[PDB]
Amino acid sequence: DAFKILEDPKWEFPRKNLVLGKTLGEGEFGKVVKATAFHLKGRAGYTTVAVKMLKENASPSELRDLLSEFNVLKQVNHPHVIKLYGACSQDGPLLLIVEYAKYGSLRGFLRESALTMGDLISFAWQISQGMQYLAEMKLVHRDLAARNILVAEGRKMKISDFGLSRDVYEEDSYVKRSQGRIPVKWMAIESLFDHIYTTQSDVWSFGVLLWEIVTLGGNPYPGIPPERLFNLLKTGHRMERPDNCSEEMYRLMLQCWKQEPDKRPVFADISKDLEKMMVK
Amino acid sequence: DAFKILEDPKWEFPRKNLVLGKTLGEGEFGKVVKATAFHLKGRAGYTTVAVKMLKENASPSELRDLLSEFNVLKQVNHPHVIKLYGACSQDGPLLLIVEYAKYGSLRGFLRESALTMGDLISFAWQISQGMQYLAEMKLVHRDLAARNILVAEGRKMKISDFGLSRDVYEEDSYVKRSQGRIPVKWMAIESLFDHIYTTQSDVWSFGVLLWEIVTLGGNPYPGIPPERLFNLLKTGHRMERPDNCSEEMYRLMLQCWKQEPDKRPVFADISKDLEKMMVK
Ligand SMILES: Cc1ccc(-c2nn(C(C)(C)C)c3ncnc(N)c23)cc1
Ligand SMILES: Cc1ccc(-c2nn(C(C)(C)C)c3ncnc(N)c23)cc1
Known part of the structure; x- marks a missing residue:
């Protein structure tokens, strides 16, 4: 057993x-x-x-x-x-x-850097398509971060680390839950106080992933103790705008960090948004 | 909260x-x-x-x-x-x-090696005295291993990593339990199937610690998959005798690996046993 x-x-x-x-x-x-x-x-x-x-x-x-x-x-x-x-x-x-994936994890691949802003939007676009698929498969990733993404041959994004994934609807009679295994700086606000993990909570983690890409492997909320992060996010405070980031890219991050999960966009809309940035 | x-x-x-x-x-x-x-x-x-x-x-x-x-x-x-x-x-x-502890962890200190068998018995003796104290304090360490011991100035042993410790008698009305955070190759047999961690279970882990010292940072049960370790230990099978190990030292390990926890020695007796090896 x-x-x-x-x-x-x-x-x-x-x-x-x-x-x-x-x-x-x-x-x-x-x-x-x-x-x-x-x-x-x-x-x-x-x-x-x-x-x-x-x-x-x-x-x-x-x-x-x-x-x-x-x-x-x-x-x-x-x-x-x-x-x-x-x-x-x-x-x-x-x-x-x-x-x-020969280029290893994404966070390691970003920190090793010749990448323009065009590749970064493509990287976020590819991950958004994978999350689109995973959402249609009724799957919650929970641990969506840069160190959990793999850069494969052709510099193509591969979502990995499904060890903490869950279904949208629990299909078991008795599931015993792991507790507090998601890094705090990536947890959605409803996951912080209510232990709730949904597809909209993965969108919150995707916003932190966008920040990791535009900063080329940056540490979200630098120096802030995770104990004070909850009281800070509860009062509507979010991260400031990074350097290499357009006004349209930073607007997408704030939508992923909305207080109400119903107000956050879905991955089907995020893919159409990131694709338009590639066109313009 | x-x-x-x-x-x-x-x-x-x-x-x-x-x-x-x-x-x-x-x-x-x-x-x-x-x-x-x-x-x-x-x-x-x-x-x-x-x-x-x-x-x-x-x-x-x-x-x-x-x-x-x-x-x-x-x-x-x-x-x-x-x-x-x-x-x-x-x-x-x-x-x-x-x-x-400037010499770092014990497993790292042993693998860096000029150590005779006299120092190894002393190292096991010092750890046995610390566990003696912790047993009198009504404390269960659970995570007793070489990588959790620190070698301090003077090459003196310092027990560390109390993050998974428990009292002998639970003094709280509702304690929510972590599950399966102890490495399998150090878990006592009663902890494997019954989730029971006592002072006598730390004696089992101390026997594995003795093996790590006499092998200078060896990997217990080499190559054996942890899934087959339980069925192997359930049938009375234990580890073979290492190279640099006397007949009296290996006899102490087997006593720490007895099936019945009541048959295992206590740390007060282990300290008197290891001290006699220093005298002879
Ligand atoms: C199921 C599974 C198996 C392996 C990996 C994995 N981790 N990693 C590191 C951690 C070295 C970047 C990898 N590097 C390259 N290719 C890979 N496939 C991996 C991820 C998930
Ligand atoms: C509470 C606590 C704090 C620190 C340590 C600790 N870990 N480690 C490593 C891991 C680098 C060997 C140490 N190395 C030297 N001295 C130490 N004190 C430690 C252990 C427990």
Whole structure:
């Protein structure tokens, strides 16, 4: 119980066909290494992939997050969402075989910088299309931030880290909830006092994501203690306008940071707004 | 609520008297930087200290862990337990001002290696005395591991990371429990299936700590998936005897890994056992 993983034959991949390589990163998310998979999703040769696994000092909750990420990735499929290829759940450790984003996370990619404002609007546009798809799939991401986005080949955005995702309507009789695992500076105001996470709350997190992009990986609300952030946001105060940001771009951030969730735009409208900035 | 920190005047220290310096480490525990504190705990000059704080992307649960660590450190006081000097809880971020262990964590100190077997028994002896004190204080550490021990000046052991500690008897009417935050390879067997954490469960974790010391920072149960560790420990299987380990030292580890918690020794007996190894 809770430790035995069900073997889904649709996603199970042989362990001998997987060649693990150098570590791409490790932390409070698991262990991710570069790898190669022969005869994957059909056949014909090898494929460069990435493999996520548990750390040597993993806790049972980190296994819950890895299984939750495994479960959500089975259902989603979008060009701007990270793609699950397979898994190794039997006769050894649990390995998730997904895509490979060589430019790494978005926050790391932005801080490494030759990017014009045209690419930044494109990056926000691609993420807005992925969230559009995830909203239509009745999924709440909750942990929408720059360090959770992956920059893949072609500098294309891939939404990742579904370990804390939830359905719009809870389809289980008894779900035991993790509490306070979302970074405060990205939580919507209704999530701060009422523990409410909806699609409109992901729009709030998308506004903070816009700020991270236009500042090329900036730290939102610099120096402000997270304890005073709630009393500050409750009085209608928001972030000031960054440097590299047009008047139309900063207006989109404030709409995502409206007090009433009903007053915030939807991702279908945000995609049409960001596309117009590419045209003009 | 939950964000406002009560100002304890006994522990409050002025922020202007604190000079933050270089970062000593950062991860799923917070942010720890080296610092200097002038006129601390009385007066007379400055003191080299360490300051723990929240990360820029901290979650509300990480504030619960920092406040729990703050609360427990107010009560304990032992030469082999990390010492709390003060805190800055008002007019800015929450900073915990504690001791300064220049040799860093124990696992990092062991992996950096000129240590004989005499020092390793001394290290285990000092930790056993601290756990002896913590047991008399009616405290359960739960997260007893090498990466949670600090090597201070004079190469002396300092127990740290009290963010997941609990009392032997719950003195609150409604405590909401974190679930599955202890690494599996250190959890006692009764904690694995029954969610039970006692002083005898810390003795189980102490046996794994002995293994980490004699192997100079080894990874317990190498390669074994944590999902198969429970079925393996349930059938009486334990770890094999390491290289640099006497027959009397490995016998102490097996006693700490007994199936019945009543059959495991207490820290008062472990200290007398480890001291005899220093004599012989
Ligand atoms: C399910 C899953 C598996 C792996 C990753 C992942 N993390 N990371 C780091 C953290 C190294 C940027 C990656 N870098 C490149 N490609 C990837 N696929 C990842 C994300 C989600
Ligand atoms: C309350 C509290 C505060 C700080 C630390 C701490 N972590 N760490 C690292 C992680 C850098 C080894 C330290 N290194 C040296 N001295 C210290 N005091 C610490 C532990 C507990």
